[PDB]
Amino acid sequence: MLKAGVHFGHQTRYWNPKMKPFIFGARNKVHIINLEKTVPMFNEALAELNKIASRKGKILFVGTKRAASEAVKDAALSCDQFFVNHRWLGGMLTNWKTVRQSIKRLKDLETQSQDGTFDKLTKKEALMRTRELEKLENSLGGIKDMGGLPDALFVIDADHEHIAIKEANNLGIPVFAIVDTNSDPDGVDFVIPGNDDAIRAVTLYLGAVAATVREGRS
Amino acid sequence: GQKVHPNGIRLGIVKPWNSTWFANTKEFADNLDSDFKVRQYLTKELAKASVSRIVIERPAKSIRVTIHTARPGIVIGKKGEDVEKLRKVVADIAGVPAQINIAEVRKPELDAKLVADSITSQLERRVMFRRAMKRAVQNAMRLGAKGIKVEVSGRLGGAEIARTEWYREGRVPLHTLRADIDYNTSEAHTTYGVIGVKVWIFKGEIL
Amino acid sequence: ELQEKLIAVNRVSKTVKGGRIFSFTALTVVGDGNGRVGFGYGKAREVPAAIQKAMEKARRNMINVALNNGTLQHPVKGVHTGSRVFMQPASEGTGIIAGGAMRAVLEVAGVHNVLAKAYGSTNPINVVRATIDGLENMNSPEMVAAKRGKSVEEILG
RNA sequence: GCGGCCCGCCGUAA
RNA sequence: GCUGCAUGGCUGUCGUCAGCUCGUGUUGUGAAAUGUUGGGUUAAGUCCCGCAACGAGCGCAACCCUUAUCCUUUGUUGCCA
RNA sequence: AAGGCGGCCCCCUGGACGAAGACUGACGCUCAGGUGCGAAAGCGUGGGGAGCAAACAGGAUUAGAUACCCUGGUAGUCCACGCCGUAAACGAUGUCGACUUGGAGGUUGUGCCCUUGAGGCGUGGCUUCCGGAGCUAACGCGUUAAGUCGACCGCCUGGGG
RNA sequence: GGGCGUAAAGCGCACGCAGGCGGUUUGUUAAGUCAGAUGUGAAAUCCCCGGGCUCAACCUGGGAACUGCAUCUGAUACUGG
């Protein structure tokens, strides 16, 4: 908008040449992103997400970078959506049928957990069951109670999470990644240029999306 | 020769004996011989029936025989005339008086002996062995079991070396003593020699 | 409704510490008889398993082509690793005269009159790509007219 | 851093 | 009586060595690969961490027998404070 | 141009590049037959000869050892003037010209700006290493193409013989 | 309507005669090229439309074809002078 609440690219030697249209003049040894062509398509993407949420699209959030972790887990579970926070497993979409069993095991174990040591006092087994529950909840916490095959994905870092992008392209699901100067627009994507590691930037990104999605239901 | 007999290794833990009686040195040999004779004669006679297991117990001055089967009607007949003939013949074989009992097999697709000789009977009618093996495995898995393994070995039509095949899915742990494994074998004589068949069934782990 | 064809099956080996282990591969083609067709390739230890595994693989992979009364108006050629394929429209009354897997592909596609011919190497797996080779890179009149910013009647004339 | 030590009859699993 | 080079059944050995595979998903035109590799550990593909892989099966370990310590019950044909 | 060229100094001599300006006006590209230049070894005539060293002679090692190892050692290696015309003479890639996303260096010129300083902007030539599309049987090549094109020339047609 | 980095295949490297190929306007020529026309290109054979032998092989009527060559008239965008 006008606060310029987003930083810009990394360096002029780590850059994908496909981003020439989106680039501005680089001055301080680093690339500068043209903000004059970031507002309109951002608003278009927001409208698209609004109409999808009005269609109960079950949006999905990703972006594991140790920075967006808590941010995306707060933006999710806020309106009506799900999220992925750690260690995107290869095949959550192309091999969802196998991940269903892991979800079922997690459901069983969380039901058993609330009365865990009552069933048996052999402390070794209780300890290892709790340890494996902890090991299992981090990779499936945000997706446990979702139907399956979401209708939209929002990605924070494009090149860093290319596995999810490839899976989405294979399945045929629209995606809404954010592309920096060292990434490239490859899939069918509503492209949002701008920095992706600045906390203010990512917060500004997710606030509008969360508000739009929560409005879309009503 | 690598595998220990699955039934023998478990006789003291989770499996019962087939013959149960007490005797001393002077009667051991003849007791065993009489048991062998009666078991062989009964197995020969009831070939057309569905006989699974024969249990022989010796009351003090008598012999008690129980037969497990899946079609008790044929063995027991219209009236009890056939069982009377069998009792007369058995009391002939062993001098002591005899009494006959009949058991019932609820799920014939279990109790591997019946599956084994069913497959052999199918093989005698010149049918493809793969169909028979798959049929039996699918039936056993459908009726409810945590594991099954079948195998056939011998001259399967070709002149080359006797080929061996086997199918298995589920769990068939052989190194656990707690497991309830039911195992039996059979053989079929064809125009190209004999064919061996072995079956393992995992009814369920026992605490 | 879907029509399926089986092209070829062959035995494949692999060496291990104890000897050699064998496996089979199956190549099948599937089409709707109207202009949509796909192919699949599967591997297994027993022949029926590979046969069934190729089928749904072909089913999920489908493309559509636009024909015209049983052919189109493009003498087209397609190339792959070592295969050259030439196909051209036939007037009428003729059939699907073609050597190997091209016959099955053009039959399931929905074509009834063609004058195909194959050059180069002729192993089945690469020549089956005749689908991807030229079938979908064919242009109908209306699409050309729309792309060139013109009308169909004067595109033909 | 460096002493030496050669050969293996003919065909032959689906 | 002949044929273990027409067979079933039953044995020896590598070797009580720690390995051997499968389903689904991806990569390659294909034979195939991935998982089973990488860091640290263990008697061990025994375990944690990382990782386009996610899980399973036969194996390993445990359930079996005997020996080493105590406590109840019973006390002859066994024992004697 | 290729074969190739390394102490220092003098004499004779060829080519390439950059900056600015002037001049002639298609005067160009390729090239069968022809001509010239080609490492090392080798040949002829005349010199020279320290080191090294085919041939050769001894000592070992070995079942044998016309070899590898040790002690010697002639032609040759050097100079002048003539022959020879072959090499894994290899980037195993013929010569010209045009077009097509990028990074990290080396070397040698030149313009501007505070020319402050080892500074900052450009702009030519020649060379190393990664890598995109594309091409390829694959390996790989990738603005110094094995990518997209044009002109001319030289070669190939199963393995042995 | 094929190839020459490793499968067979780029001369060891240059100079250069005969040959092959030419950056851009302007003006002429109509050699190449293009359009008509005329004369030729035997008959038989092939093809097409027909006809007659009881049908068919077989015979026959008419037409296209004979891709060419020469001559005349015209066109001037592209090669050549």
Curated annotation (Swiss-Prot), chain A:
A Gene Ontology cellular-component term: cytosolic small ribosomal subunit
Database matches in CDD domains: RPS2 (cd01425)
Modified sites of kind N6-succinyllysine: K107
Any one Pfam family match given in the protein's UniProt record, by short name: Ribosomal_S2
Entry GO MF terms: structural constituent of ribosome; zinc ion binding
PROSITE patterns in alphabetical order: RIBOSOMAL_S2_1, RIBOSOMAL_S2_2
A GO biological process held by the record: cytoplasmic translation
Alphabetized UniProt keyword annotations: Ribonucleoprotein, Ribosomal protein
Protein function: Required for ribosomal protein bS1 (rpsA) to bind to the 30S subunit.
Subunit structure: Part of the 30S ribosomal subunit, contacts bS1. Some nascent polypeptide chains are able to cross-link to this protein in situ. In collided ribosomes contacts ribosome rescue factor SmrB.
Family stated for the protein in its record: Belongs to the universal ribosomal protein uS2 family.
Record protein name field: Small ribosomal subunit protein uS2
Organism: Escherichia coli (strain K12)
Chain's gene name: rpsB
Swiss-Prot record, chain B:
Disulfide bonds: none
KH type-2 domain residues: 38-106
Gene3D superfamilies with a match to the protein in the record: 3.30.300.20, Ribosomal protein S3, C-terminal domain
GO process terms (BP): cytoplasmic translation; ribosomal small subunit assembly
Function: Binds the lower part of the 30S subunit head. Binds mRNA in the 70S ribosome, positioning it for translation. Plays a role in mRNA unwinding by the ribosome, possibly by forming part of a processivity clamp.
Quaternary data: Part of the 30S ribosomal subunit. Forms a tight complex with proteins uS10 and uS14. With proteins uS4 and uS5 encircles the mRNA as it enters the ribosome, which may play a role in mRNA helicase processivity. Some nascent polypeptide chains are able to cross-link to this protein in situ. In collided ribosomes contacts ribosome rescue factor SmrB.
Record-given protein name: Small ribosomal subunit protein uS3
From Swiss-Prot, chain C:
InterPro entries: Ribosomal_Su5_D2-typ_SF (IPR020568), Ribosomal_uS5 (IPR000851), Ribosomal_uS5_bac-type (IPR005712), Ribosomal_uS5_C (IPR005324), Ribosomal_uS5_N (IPR013810), Ribosomal_uS5_N_CS (IPR018192), Ribsml_uS5_D2-typ_fold_subgr (IPR014721)
GO cellular component: cytoplasm; cytosol; cytosolic small ribosomal subunit
GO molecular function, one term: structural constituent of ribosome
Alphabetized UniProt keyword annotations: Acetylation, Antibiotic resistance, Ribonucleoprotein, Ribosomal protein, RNA-binding, rRNA-binding
Domain S5 DRBM: 2-65
GO-annotated biological processes: cytoplasmic translation; maintenance of translational fidelity; response to antibiotic; ribosomal small subunit assembly; translation
Domain-related comment: The N-terminal domain interacts with the head of the 30S subunit; the C-terminal domain interacts with the body and contacts protein uS4. The interaction surface between uS4 and uS5 is involved in control of translational fidelity.
UniProt-listed NCBIfam families: rpsE_bact
Entries under PANTHER family matching the protein: MITOCHONDRIAL RIBOSOMAL PROTEIN S5 (PTHR48277:SF1)
Role this protein plays: With uS4 and uS12 plays an important role in translational accuracy. Many suppressors of streptomycin-dependent mutants of protein uS12 are found in this protein, some but not all of which decrease translational accuracy (ram, ribosomal ambiguity mutations).
Oligomer status and interactors: Part of the 30S ribosomal subunit. Contacts proteins uS4 and uS8. With proteins uS4 and uS5 encircles the mRNA as it enters the ribosome, which may play a role in mRNA helicase processivity. Can be cross-linked to mRNA. In collided ribosomes contacts ribosome rescue factor SmrB.
Miscellaneous: Altered uS5 proteins have been identified in a number of mutants. Some mutations in uS5 have been shown to increase translational error frequencies.
Similarity field: Belongs to the universal ribosomal protein uS5 family.
Stated name of the protein: Small ribosomal subunit protein uS5
Organism of origin: Escherichia coli (strain K12)
Name of the gene: rpsE
